[PDB]
Design a protein around this ligand. Structure first.
Ligand code: CL
Ligand code: CL
Length: 162
């Protein structure tokens, strides 16, 4: 298992614009298009992102290309973030995947806001961090996905995904 396979399990793959769990216009592998309510603003962003007139639909390769950029952007965002970088540096390879996952889903800013949990992760207090991470809107909104990520942080194994 690796970060790509993990996020592909968590986000799925859709070749037509869809709305995410929060109601936003998305396409491919969790690629957020816009927070605007307009399908047109969504189609425009999509065409901008792909470099072609898509009429809201893309092929698998296009989906995967966006996905590669997003994972890359995620990792680089973590490494440029003064609050996140130290956490990441401290972690083993599996747990690093868990943090990248959170950042892909909720952006750097959002994760950077989990002050207490980040400190607990840094100190390698697994059980405590797992309990703290569960007291969040995130967990209440996407309980199944949150549980998988959290289990990954607690255990440091890919069990939740097997
Ligand atoms: Cl883009
Ligand atoms: Cl969920």
């Amino acid at each position: 298992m690796n970060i790509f396979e993990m996020l592909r399990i968590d986000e799925g793959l859709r070749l037509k614009i869809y709305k995410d769990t929060e109601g936003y216009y998305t396409i491919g592998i969790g690629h957020l298009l816009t927070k605007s309510p307009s399908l047109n603003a969504a189609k425009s962003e999509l065409d901008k992102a792909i470099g072609r007139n898509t009429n809201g639909v893309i092929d698998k390769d296009e989906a995967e290309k966006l996905f590669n950029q997003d994972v890359d952007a995620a990792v680089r965002g973590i490494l440029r973030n003064a609050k996140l970088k130290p956490v990441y540096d401290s972690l083993d390879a599996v747990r690093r995947a868990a943090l990248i996952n959170m950042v892909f889903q909720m952006g750097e800013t959002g994760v950077a806001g989990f002050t207490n949990s980040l400190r607990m992760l840094q100190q390698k207090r697994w059980d405590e961090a797992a309990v703290n991470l569960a007291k969040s809107r995130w967990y209440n909104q996407t309980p199944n996905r949150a549980k998988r990520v959290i289990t990954t942080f607690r255990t440091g194994t890919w069990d939740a995904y097997k």
